Amino acid sequence: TSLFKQERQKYIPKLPNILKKDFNNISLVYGENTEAIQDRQALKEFFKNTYGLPIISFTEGESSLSFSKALNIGIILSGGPAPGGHNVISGVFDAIKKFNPNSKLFGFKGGPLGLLENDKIELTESLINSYRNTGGFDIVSSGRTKIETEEHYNKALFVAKENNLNAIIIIGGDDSNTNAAILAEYFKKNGENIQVIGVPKTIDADLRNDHIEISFGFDSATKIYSELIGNLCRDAMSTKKYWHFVKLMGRSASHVALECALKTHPNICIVSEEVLAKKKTLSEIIDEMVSVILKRSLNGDNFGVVIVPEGLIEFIPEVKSLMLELCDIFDKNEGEFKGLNIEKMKEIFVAKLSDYMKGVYLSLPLFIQFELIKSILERDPHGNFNVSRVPTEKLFIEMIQSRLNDMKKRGEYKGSFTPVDHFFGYEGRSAFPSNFDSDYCYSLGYNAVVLILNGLTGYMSCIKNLNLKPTDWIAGGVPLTMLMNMEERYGEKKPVIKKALVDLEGRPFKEFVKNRDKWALNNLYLYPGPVQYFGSSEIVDEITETLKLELF
Amino acid sequence: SLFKQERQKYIPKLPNILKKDFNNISLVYGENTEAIQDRQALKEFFKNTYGLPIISFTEGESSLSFSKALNIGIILSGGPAPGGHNVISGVFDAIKKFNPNSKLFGFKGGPLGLLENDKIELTESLINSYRNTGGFDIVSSGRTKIETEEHYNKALFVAKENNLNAIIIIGGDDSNTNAAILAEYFKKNGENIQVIGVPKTIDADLRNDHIEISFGFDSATKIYSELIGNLCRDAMSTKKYWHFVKLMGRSASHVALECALKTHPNICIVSEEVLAKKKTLSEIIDEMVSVILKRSLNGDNFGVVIVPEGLIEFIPEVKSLMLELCDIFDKNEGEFKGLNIEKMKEIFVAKLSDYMKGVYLSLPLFIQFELIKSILERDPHGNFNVSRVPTEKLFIEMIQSRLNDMKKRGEYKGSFTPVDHFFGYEGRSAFPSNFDSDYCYSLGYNAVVLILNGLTGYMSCIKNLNLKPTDWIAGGVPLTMLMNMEERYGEKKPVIKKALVDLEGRPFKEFVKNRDKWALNNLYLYPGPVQYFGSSEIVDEITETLKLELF
């Protein structure tokens, strides 16, 4: 397309030294016998044929392989895009073609649904070439259909068989890596010989553990967000008149928010996990932001930058309690709402709420009051709600203006508060991957094929030592069951892999805690650049602050 | 920041001429000049600096108007543009070269810093930490308009007390308006203080035959196009979202048009064309809806739209409304003195003419209030606040309604999922590209050469910008040639005329040729992040606009 794209296309991703060796010269080294996180008992029931598989690692030396004929592989992309997905695919292609030039790669379109519907294309050399080192999932598009029913699982197998597949690779987050486990068990249960391999994808870093150091895409997304946030800090510093509020996409955790904070040194950054842990109130959050603004104003600084995660309102205990009460006032007094008008029925809630929750409700902006009513009036069959109708940054902005307007009227705020809001997310997830994600993703995909060539199913492709140069990285496999627990929902116990949230005892969070009061009151902004793909190795192979601190 | 550390070490590239000794660089005088329009009245006002000659530099001797160390003052004005700090580093390096005893003084927060004698000395170690960086934060900036005899008296007193040989003003059309009049004041009153302007703005609305582009436009459009290309790729990857992207640019669509030529979005609105064709808001809406429907029938329930922030000043019915709201406020200001926005709205509605009131009340309520704020938050030069007006959200709401109208007859079976964006503040203080780094350093270094050669009332000017920096031509354009008479705050005044998109120009014509293609097909281009190290080709890329314009 652009000159950038053609040049980037020519980049050769860097492999672990071992993945460079011939396939006959790569030996399995078996590990222990893994166990689940919890419900170690019931996970032996559900996953009879797959459980307690050892962790796999790879070392040099002679080995015999499970194939000699050409392989056929199906590949699925599920969920939202992450920079480097296309490199997982280029790595798989390059690996099967090295093994046997007659091997074929089939890309199922628009998620797992493509497999159910036999909606696919053959990825050929010239096709693959155009996608090398590119952003996007647009080689085959993604979706998020789950394979659940017996009718579904049988079609998956049907389509797999009529396409002569030896294996399926699924690239996705927590939920598709869980699904990958059950498909692997399903094939093995019905005596079929199709292997399933999982690959760890998410720009939000909510898939990770002792074995998976990071998910793919998080490096590239945070670099883009931090460049944009650093640029806003520099603009704020230059004109000294605007408070920029930046919401970042992803409602599950503060991994992205925390990393951008470490990259840019903003004046304020809110961590959802901490808000939940310290049980902070809405007014406490507001008090704390207002106090930073006033103090800066007294230093003569009528500007600053705030970072908030998208899922923040769902981490305020007080808000859920207010919500659970309002719809209890709705589930009871059903006939009283006929028939009603809202604004008229608002004062019904206002008169019926408990003293303190009425104070919380009325503290909100008026449009927010109404959006909570609408949230209840639209609960799913199981009666549960979500607060998606309330935008975190805009809620905070209005409440802050209000507090400050009152203070000005009684003469305790001389400064000027002019807010500008920003929401980033879509422009970071289909960006060109950094060298790190390019190397990492290419490695994961290449490694997936080695796992398949050794007969393995139910494994997640895994590359460790990610803080070191790629030649020094270590390749292997993690069994999918060991990451699981049983989640109970509506009388049922389905297997799950739980979201990894920010560890409030981790080095990243502790680093942030150590320095945040200093960043708040002073102007110690750091200005990261755009992602570089040419120049010295330490610029082009820079990793996240997160990974740097966590490992070491 | 490791990036900043490595980038700080870049050596900007100068025109060959500027590398020669200052006693080796001679003038070439040329064509005389005049203003763009209202030339008669402007010849009264600018009686001392009208019709000066175009300047170039060549290898020779030249009469050097200075034998003793220089004292220069320097002003950063208006909104930031990447490379302002390289302008400053080019002035500093040049005056140190000339005479190591030369001092450079930075006035803080724009022209107000001059008026209030608020400054800092810009020293070698201070300049060093800002080399090749984004931002205007070395001294910060502001948008103050110097008009009154007292303001100019003050400007004179501060200038004279600081023993200043020359003042360098870095800014846009608003600031070079200040600079033009200041040079005229100093001359008319008989003083030896020289005033040189520098052509800054991400909006590129400071342009003529001689000034090929303003600095910062290159860097800003590059970051904005990276992001839009990323949104195009996400839309292609997931196939469900219609992205509406507002862009900075102020009045002109130079920014929007460049980003469209960089990315091939499905829709880009060009305000200048809207005004030429006298389109109504409703007509713009329907043209967008038609594109959306067609794509949907083709199975593409996604796309990307570029919206210029200045559009409201180019739709005849809305422009007219905004001028009447302005007129109503300016004439009944005391009534509005204390009131909230709802009470303000009530007055505005009561005082609008019947036609204008119907227009106003046809807008969504959120737009009704933002229009008022647009008027109330006019800058010191009288510009409306268009950056705060969510034009893209107005588009989304009106398109949403029309698509529901088609859906009501079974004529639109897709689901519309719009996403709003506004790329602006995040592009202004970004790290400058090699182009802007090279161009800005040359412009500052060149302003010193012009000062050394006794000039005042000139814009620093580097020509042949599509060529390798060594092959650039250095010189100077008289500030008056850019000027005309306009009404600001209910009164007629001399200003630099804003250069808008030329509908007969090569950039717009390239867009028209391909735009229909880009609407119905998915022909997106994906520019990457600006590269600062590496192959001469990717690192020294320039804008589509500049290539087409010099072709």
Ligand SMILES: O=P(O)(O)OC[C@H]1O[C@](O)(COP(=O)(O)O)[C@@H](O)[C@@H]1O
């Ligand atoms: O910085 P502000 O006061 O919000 O004003 C925004 C305006 O400044 C700009 O970013 C730059 O304008 P100038 O280059 O003319 O100073 C415009 O694009 C935008 O309309």
